[PDB]
Amino acid sequence: SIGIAVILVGTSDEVAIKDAHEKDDFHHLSVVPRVELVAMNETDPKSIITRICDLMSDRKIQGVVFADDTDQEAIAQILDFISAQTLTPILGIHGGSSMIMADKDESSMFFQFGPSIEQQASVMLNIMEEYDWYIFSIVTTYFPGYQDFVNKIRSTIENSFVGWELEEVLLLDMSLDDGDSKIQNQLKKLQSPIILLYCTKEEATYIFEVANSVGLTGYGYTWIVPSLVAGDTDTVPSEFPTGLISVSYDEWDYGLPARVRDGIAIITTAASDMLSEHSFIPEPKSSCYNTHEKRIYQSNMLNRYLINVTFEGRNLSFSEDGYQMHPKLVIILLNKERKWERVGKWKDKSLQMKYYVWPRMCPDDHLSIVTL
Amino acid sequence: IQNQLKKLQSPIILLYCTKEEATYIFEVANSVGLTGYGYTWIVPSLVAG
Amino acid sequence: LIKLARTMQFTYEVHLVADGKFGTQERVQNSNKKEWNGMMGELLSGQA
Amino acid sequence: KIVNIGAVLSTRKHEQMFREAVNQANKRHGSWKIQLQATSVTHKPNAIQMALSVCEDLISSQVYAILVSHPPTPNDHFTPTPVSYTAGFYRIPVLGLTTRMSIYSDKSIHLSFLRTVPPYSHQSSVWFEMMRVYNWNHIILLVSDDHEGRAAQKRLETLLEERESKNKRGPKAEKVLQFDPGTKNVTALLMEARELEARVIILSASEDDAATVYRAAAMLDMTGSGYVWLVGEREISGNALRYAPDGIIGLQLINGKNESAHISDAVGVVAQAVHELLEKENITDPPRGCVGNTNIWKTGPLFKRVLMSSKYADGVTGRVEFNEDGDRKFAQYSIMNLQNRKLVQVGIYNGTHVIPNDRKIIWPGGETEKPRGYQMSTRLKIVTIHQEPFVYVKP
Numbered sequence: 001s002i003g004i005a006v007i008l009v010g011t012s013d014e015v016a017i018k019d020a021h022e023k024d025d026f027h028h029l030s031v032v033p034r035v036e037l038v039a040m041n042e043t044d045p046k047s048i049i050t051r052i053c054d055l056m057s058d059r060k061i062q063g064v065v066f067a068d069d070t071d072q073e074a075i076a077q078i079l080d081f082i083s084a085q086t087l088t089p090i091l092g093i094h095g096g097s098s099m100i101m102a103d104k105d106e107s108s109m110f111f112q113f114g115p116s117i118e119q120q121a122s123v124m125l126n127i128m129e130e131y132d133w134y135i136f137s138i139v140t141t142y143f144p145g146y147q148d149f150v151n152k153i154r155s156t157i158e159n160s161f162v163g164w165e166l167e168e169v170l171l172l173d174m175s176l177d178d179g180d181s182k183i184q185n186q187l188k189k190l191q192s193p194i195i196l197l198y199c200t201k202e203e204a205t206y207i208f209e210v211a212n213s214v215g216l217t218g219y220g221y222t223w224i225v226p227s228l229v230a231g232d233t234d235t236v237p238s239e240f241p242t243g244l245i246s247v248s249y250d251e252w253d254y255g256l257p258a259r260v261r262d263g264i265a266i267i268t269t270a271a272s273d274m275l276s277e278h279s280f281i282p283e284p285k286s287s288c289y290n291t292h293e294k295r296i297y298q299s300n301m302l303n304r305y306l307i308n309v310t311f312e313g314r315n316l317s318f319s320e321d322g323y324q325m326h327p328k329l330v331i332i333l334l335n336k337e338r339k340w341e342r343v344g345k346w347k348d349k350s351l352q353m354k355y356y357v358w359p360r361m362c363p364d365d366h367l368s369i370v371t372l
Numbered sequence: 373i374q375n376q377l378k379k380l381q382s383p384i385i386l387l388y389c390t391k392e393e394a395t396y397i398f399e400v401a402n403s404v405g406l407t408g409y410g411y412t413w414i415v416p417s418l419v420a421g
Numbered sequence: 422l423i424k425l426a427r428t429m430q431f432t433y434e435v436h437l438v439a440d441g442k443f444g445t446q447e448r449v450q451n452s453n454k455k456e457w458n459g460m461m462g463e464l465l466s467g468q469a
Numbered sequence: 470k471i472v473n474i475g476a477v478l479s480t481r482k483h484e485q486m487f488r489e490a491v492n493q494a495n496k497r498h499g500s501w502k503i504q505l506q507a508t509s510v511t512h513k514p515n516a517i518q519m520a521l522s523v524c525e526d527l528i529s530s531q532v533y534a535i536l537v538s539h540p541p542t543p544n545d546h547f548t549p550t551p552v553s554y555t556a557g558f559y560r561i562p563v564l565g566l567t568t569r570m571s572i573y574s575d576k577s578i579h580l581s582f583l584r585t586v587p588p589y590s591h592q593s594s595v596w597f598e599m600m601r602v603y604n605w606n607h608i609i610l611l612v613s614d615d616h617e618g619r620a621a622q623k624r625l626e627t628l629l630e631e632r633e634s635k636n637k638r639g640p641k642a643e644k645v646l647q648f649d650p651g652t653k654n655v656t657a658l659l660m661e662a663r664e665l666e667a668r669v670i671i672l673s674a675s676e677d678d679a680a681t682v683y684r685a686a687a688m689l690d691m692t693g694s695g696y697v698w699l700v701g702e703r704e705i706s707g708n709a710l711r712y713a714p715d716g717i718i719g720l721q722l723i724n725g726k727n728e729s730a731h732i733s734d735a736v737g738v739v740a741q742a743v744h745e746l747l748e749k750e751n752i753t754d755p756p757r758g759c760v761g762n763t764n765i766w767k768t769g770p771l772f773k774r775v776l777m778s779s780k781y782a783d784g785v786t787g788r789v790e791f792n793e794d795g796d797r798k799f800a801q802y803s804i805m806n807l808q809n810r811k812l813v814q815v816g817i818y819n820g821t822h823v824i825p826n827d828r829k830i831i832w833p834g835g836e837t838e839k840p841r842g843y844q845m846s847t848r849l850k851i852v853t854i855h856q857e858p859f860v861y862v863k864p
């Protein structure tokens with residue numbers, strides 16, 4: 001009996017109680033996919049701590065799968081700390097937990113469910129190299145993750161055989177709102193169509209109203225943002241210029257029960273590939289991490305076998321820092337109706353989208369020429 | 373029209389208006405950053421002279 | 422080289438290149454990093 | 470009103486110290502519009518139950534900020550984390566005293582957190598200043614692969630990346646060298662480092678690794694004359710001195726682990742901030758309770774930010790002020806030396822002034838002149854291609 005638990009908190013997913021029985025197709029590995037399910041209303045730290053280690057103390061939970069919402073990544077930190085303290089592979093999968101922590105802990109076994117930063121940067125570069133040919137600028141505050149975002153696209157810029165003329169990157173000290181007007185003069189000095197930026201939501205509002213003050217919001221431009229600027233909503237604020245493009249996770253069609261099944265399969269396939277090949281013991285814990293963490297500390301960790309697991313015809317391996325190689329991404333844009341229209345899919349560095357011509361929304365040029 | 377004034381990608385601009393209008397236009401060109409040294413302005417013997 | 426060294430107090434050892442080619446830029450197969458070929462590479466890598 | 474704070478320590482006598490300190494704060498500051506008061510608890514060997522006791526603290530009082538020190542345990546890394554996670558659920562600004570690990574400064578993981586001491590990362594600024602002083606302009610940078618190492622490396626590079634360009638170029642790292650924590654037989658790395666021009670290296674790793682590389686160099690004698698190097702603070706303590714080559718350069722914090730002055734400074738600055746907070750617009754509560762209330766303290770960020778910008782008057786540790794991320798600035802540093810199996814203050818680093826005001830530095834090989842690095846190679850290595858009228862090839 002492999003202890004797999006599913007926790008759905010503050011959610012509306014009662015019908016998923018039937019979704020667990022869809023895991024009866026787990027005969028391919030033929031190792032016990034023993035599974036139960038729990039639930040809960042509104043959540044705090046204390047509730048989570050108590051509830052989960054009560055469960056693991058009750059019925060020998062080998063692993064657990066989380067799912068919640070309301071976007072308070074504090075739970076994403078809490079679950080990681082728990083994982084570290086108990087040496088137990090948990091797998092948080094939904095909007096609440098699925099917010100990538102940059103630097104997790106060492107003794108953790110967390111393995112979140114979503115895309116990194118560099119992957120978003122590479123998708124941006126693919127989109128750009130399709131039509132608009134130059135990374136004409138990068139304007140970013142120094143919110144964390146800063147130095148890596150620039151480094152990734154720069155490393156891809158240099159290491160290519162096509163044009164890629166980057167004009168200038170320039171940060172801004174948003175913490176003191178005086179010199180931003182001069183740096184925004186210099187932002188007008190970004191005489192360049194395709195600009196890129198990376199900051200928080202309120203910073204995006206501020207920068208967009210400033211670019212309105214210097215008129216860079218016009219149609220002689222185009223903007224791109226990662227899956228952090230306002231993507232976590234269907235309510236766009238003001239100041240957001242239309243035509244704006246982003247790249248977010250596919251939270252619009254990817255089935256929550258499909259997610260649950262995927263995670264269940266993940267843990268089961270891992271347990272099989274560990275035991276059947278070694279006949280080892282993924283020994284359960286006596287209690288939640290009260291005193292006896294030492295007896296389990298001696299056991300070698302199956303994380304190596306949890307890293308690389310396929311199933312269903314999909315490569316679902318992670319990286320060492322807990323994010324998906326080969327995730328499922330989509331591209332979205334802000335049309336005139338101020339609603340996030342879904343445009344393109346992405347898999348294996350491929351792109352499929354709206355027809356080969358770009359929409360090029362309205363605020364008289366760009367004739368269309370025919371030949372043979 | 374001041375966005376279009378930024379669309380005056382051009383060093384030597386000329387203008388002709390009253391004094392208060394000159395103040396207004398100059399603060400606007402400050403708002404769109406055309407007051408910078410990538411420019412030069414000329415006025416007739418009516419603006420504040 | 423002899424005259425230059427006598428003028429500048431060197432000490433050295435000469436070795437021919439490994440693959441005869443002068444040098445040009447190339448993106449190798451089964452990777453993304455474009456690499457300097459041949460002798461230029463033997464310089465830029467650290468071998469000379 | 471009755472505004473409350475709290476902290477978790479390990480002495481249990483600094484409990485009474487902190488009580489007397491907040492007593493003084495009551496008597497000292499303000500025109501008595503409100504009252505101030507606190508409550509202290511202590512650590513425990515279970516991390517989970519420790520966070521639980523923090524939740525108990527947070528229910529037992531409408532807390533306004535929390536403080537915490539380091540217990541006598543050596544697990545310095547993972548001790549002060551659970552309170553920060555538990556508070557971030559409500560953006561309760563928390564202030565740290567006796568921890569240095571640089572993972573904490575990340576504004577995206579411990580989004581509500583401040584401290585009274587700069588972390589190990591900032592240690593590189595004094596290195597850069599010493600480099601400017603003694604004109605050493607070819608430096609080897611040997612570091613570990615922990616997040617700490619990468620933080621130190623990134624900070625040092627972005628600091629030395631002056632390159633303004635509107636005699637010669639400024640000091641520049643010749644190369645860097647990664648290195649895996651806890652591993653033995655690093656000799657392969659030192660063997661690669663040996664044949665460079667530079668005669669000066671820099672190290673930053675844990676103390677056991679320091680001992681390992683010290684012995685490894687002792688086998689290869691990168692410790693002879695002409696070689697000089699300098700380290701952080703934890704490379705000259707514990708298992709270090711038993712293997713340090715006589716004459717290295719280290720440094721330590723001016724005050725260090727005398728946390729009582731820190732207690733005083735912290736309570737003073739928190740009081741100074743709160744008596745500027747309470748009037749703004751809509752404080753109205755901290756979240757009473759640590760259960761059921763699944764919402765955030767709607768004023769946390771603003772109180773935290775104004776606490777950050779709060780320039781203090783004068784503490785037991787001089788004028789204290791916080792960086793753009795909540796870390797004490799301008800703190801002093803004291804340069805040391807391994808004066809033949811002994812430590813000695815050879816100069817003090819006053820904030821930005823470096824003050825060599827002592828007898829004499831003694832460099833490793835036993836010499837007495839400040840050596841220069843980069844004894845440029847006299848031997849060269851030349852490549853050439855077989856081309857008839859310019860280079861002939863004959864057996």
Ligand SMILES: *[C@@H]1O[C@H](CO)[C@@H](O[C@@H]2O[C@H](CO)[C@@H](O)[C@H](O)[C@H]2NC(C)=O)[C@H](O)[C@H]1NC(C)=O
Pocket residue numbers: 308309310315316317325
């Ligand atoms: C899933 O993808 C990863 C990475 O694309 C694969 O790991 C590669 O596996 C091949 C073996 O054929 C190695 O040669 C590569 O070096 C691996 N890549 C990396 C980055 O380590 C993995 O094999 C894939 N698994 C499946 C089932 O497709």
Ligand SMILES: *[C@@H]1O[C@H](CO)[C@@H](O)[C@H](O)[C@H]1NC(C)=O
Pocket residue numbers: 308309310
């Ligand atoms: C990873 O998983 C694949 C599954 O196809 C397997 O063939 C391979 O042996 C595993 N390990 C590595 C290192 O690729």
Ligand SMILES: *[C@@H]1O[C@H](CO)[C@@H](O)[C@H](O)[C@H]1NC(C)=O
Pocket residue numbers: 654655656657
């Ligand atoms: C291990 O240490 C020995 C010291 O005798 C050394 O000769 C050897 O090269 C080292 N191994 C590696 C891989 O560096």
Ligand SMILES: *[C@@H]1O[C@H](CO)[C@@H](O)[C@H](O)[C@H]1NC(C)=O
Pocket residue numbers: 727729730785
């Ligand atoms: C801490 O410092 C204060 C003054 O800075 C001093 O009075 C006190 O004795 C010190 N405590 C210890 C333990 O060194």
